[PDB]
Design an enzyme around this catalytic site. Structure first.
Site, PDB file in Angstrom:
ATOM      1  N   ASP A  11       0.864  -1.178   0.000  1.00 40.32           N
ATOM      2  CA  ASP A  11       0.000   0.000   0.000  1.00 40.32           C
ATOM      3  C   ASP A  11       0.901   1.228   0.000  1.00 40.32           C
ATOM      4  O   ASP A  11       1.806   1.324   0.833  1.00 40.32           O
ATOM      5  CB  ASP A  11      -0.900   0.037   1.240  1.00 40.32           C
ATOM      6  CG  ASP A  11      -1.997  -1.022   1.236  1.00 40.32           C
ATOM      7  OD1 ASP A  11      -1.926  -2.005   0.476  1.00 40.32           O
ATOM      8  OD2 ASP A  11      -2.953  -0.859   2.026  1.00 40.32           O
ATOM      9  N   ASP A 130     -15.803  -3.219   1.408  1.00 42.68           N
ATOM     10  CA  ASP A 130     -15.212  -2.849   2.689  1.00 42.68           C
ATOM     11  C   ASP A 130     -16.346  -2.531   3.655  1.00 42.68           C
ATOM     12  O   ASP A 130     -17.079  -1.555   3.466  1.00 42.68           O
ATOM     13  CB  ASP A 130     -14.243  -1.682   2.528  1.00 42.68           C
ATOM     14  CG  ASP A 130     -13.135  -1.983   1.521  1.00 42.68           C
ATOM     15  OD1 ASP A 130     -12.741  -3.161   1.386  1.00 42.68           O
ATOM     16  OD2 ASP A 130     -12.661  -1.037   0.857  1.00 42.68           O
TER      17      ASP A 130
HETATM   18  N1  LIG Z   1      -8.365   3.678   4.274  1.00 45.23           N
HETATM   19  C1  LIG Z   1      -7.765   2.675   3.641  1.00 45.23           C
HETATM   20  O1  LIG Z   1      -6.811   2.054   4.087  1.00 45.23           O
HETATM   21  C2  LIG Z   1      -8.281   2.329   2.303  1.00 45.23           C
HETATM   22  N2  LIG Z   1      -9.206   2.913   1.515  1.00 45.23           N
HETATM   23  C3  LIG Z   1      -9.288   2.178   0.368  1.00 45.23           C
HETATM   24  N3  LIG Z   1      -8.442   1.124   0.386  1.00 45.23           N
HETATM   25  C4  LIG Z   1      -8.263   0.133  -0.687  1.00 45.23           C
HETATM   26  O2  LIG Z   1      -8.389   0.865  -1.905  1.00 45.23           O
HETATM   27  C5  LIG Z   1      -9.386   0.279  -2.737  1.00 45.23           C
HETATM   28  C6  LIG Z   1     -10.531   1.260  -2.940  1.00 45.23           C
HETATM   29  O3  LIG Z   1     -10.123   2.461  -3.594  1.00 45.23           O
HETATM   30  P1  LIG Z   1     -11.329   3.207  -4.314  1.00 45.23           P
HETATM   31  O4  LIG Z   1     -12.266   3.508  -3.183  1.00 45.23           O
HETATM   32  O5  LIG Z   1     -10.800   4.407  -5.037  1.00 45.23           O
HETATM   33  O6  LIG Z   1     -11.795   2.143  -5.280  1.00 45.23           O
HETATM   34  C7  LIG Z   1      -9.858  -1.002  -2.063  1.00 45.23           C
HETATM   35  O7  LIG Z   1      -9.234  -2.127  -2.686  1.00 45.23           O
HETATM   36  C8  LIG Z   1      -9.379  -0.895  -0.632  1.00 45.23           C
HETATM   37  O8  LIG Z   1      -8.875  -2.149  -0.160  1.00 45.23           O
HETATM   38  C9  LIG Z   1      -7.807   1.176   1.538  1.00 45.23           C
HETATM   39  N4  LIG Z   1      -6.862   0.290   1.950  1.00 45.23           N
END
Ligand SMILES: NC(=O)c1ncn([C@@H]2O[C@H](COP(=O)(O)O)[C@@H](O)[C@H]2O)c1N
Length: 240
Positions: A11, A130
């Site tokens: 990440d 999520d």
């Molecule tokens: N706050 C966070 O850590 C977080 N927010 C989003 N994500 C990851 O990013 C993705 C979502 O991004 P978007 O919401 O632009 O599709 C998903 O795969 C999710 O696991 C995270 N790890």
């Protein structure tokens, strides 16, 4: 067979490999170079890399060129996520040659766009769910976005190929996977389910692997690998 796929996670925020707690902005622990982290997982035998642009997910700029460099360095399968919400961000993501992308916020905010992208790109698309209880969260997990079952039903009928399921209360906490949620999602779809968040031990990976017959295909692992709870080699041995 019984094998669970393992996806070590990288990440990216502000050019660094980081881990968050509950995915909350501001809880970053930094673990150095995203490129060196990915190369290390690949060297230890990873079959997959789960690669996330967190700045893009939070809307605080992006790391697009760095993400591209990391993906270009991988000979293994790559799952790419973070801020993929429109045609231009999807085009650049797929241009990495990644095996698939994850769409999160877009499934809540633009369901018609996600339906279009599923129809045009098939199993290059997976949707990240999520969850807090039975409520989906979007925009870097800063706002509500719908009900778990209603959204799964819609994406099921749109032909969505695969779901990545995170319990936000487990994510980054080392408190173990939410096995009840994983099994609940497997009951509601015949699509492969990838578990994400909370893994803390090899026993946790074995318990997720126990759900492979129910439809769990893989597990994403972040904090426990960076914290050296176990080595990737040990995790691969435990999930074969
Ligand atoms: N706050 C966070 O850590 C977080 N927010 C989003 N994500 C990851 O990013 C993705 C979502 O991004 P978007 O919401 O632009 O599709 C998903 O795969 C999710 O696991 C995270 N790890």
């Amino acid at each position: 067979m019984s094998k669970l796929e393992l996806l070590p996670a990288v990440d990216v925020r502000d050019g660094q490999a980081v881990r968050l707690v509950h995915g909350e902005s501001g809880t970053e622990t930094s673990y150095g170079s995203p490129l060196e982290a990915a190369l290390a997982w690949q060297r230890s035998g990873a079959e997959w890399l789960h690669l996330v642009d967190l700045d893009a997910a939070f809307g605080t700029g992006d790391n697009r060129a760095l993400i591209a460099e990391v993906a270009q360095a991988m000979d293994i399968k790559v799952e790419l996520s973070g801020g993929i919400r429109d045609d231009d961000t999807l085009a650049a993501a797929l241009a990495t040659g990644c095996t698939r992308v994850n769409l999160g916020t877009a499934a809540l905010e633009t369901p018609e766009w996600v339906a279009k992208v599923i129809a045009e790109h098939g199993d290059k698309i997976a949707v990240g769910l999520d969850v807090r209880g039975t409520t989906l969260r979007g925009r870097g997990w800063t706002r509500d976005g719908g009900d778990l079952y209603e959204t799964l039903d819609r994406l099921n009928k749109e032909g969505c190929a695969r779901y990545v399921v995170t319990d936000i209360a487990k994510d980054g906490t080392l408190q173990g996977p939410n096995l009840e949620l994983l099994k609940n999602v497997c009951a509601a779809t015949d699509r492969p389910v990838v578990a994400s968040g909370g893994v803390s031990s090899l026993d946790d990976l074995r318990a997720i692997a126990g759900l492979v017959p129910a439809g769990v295909e893989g597990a994403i692992v972040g904090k426990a690998l960076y914290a050296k709870a176990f080595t990737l080699e040990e995790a691969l041995e435990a999930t074969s």
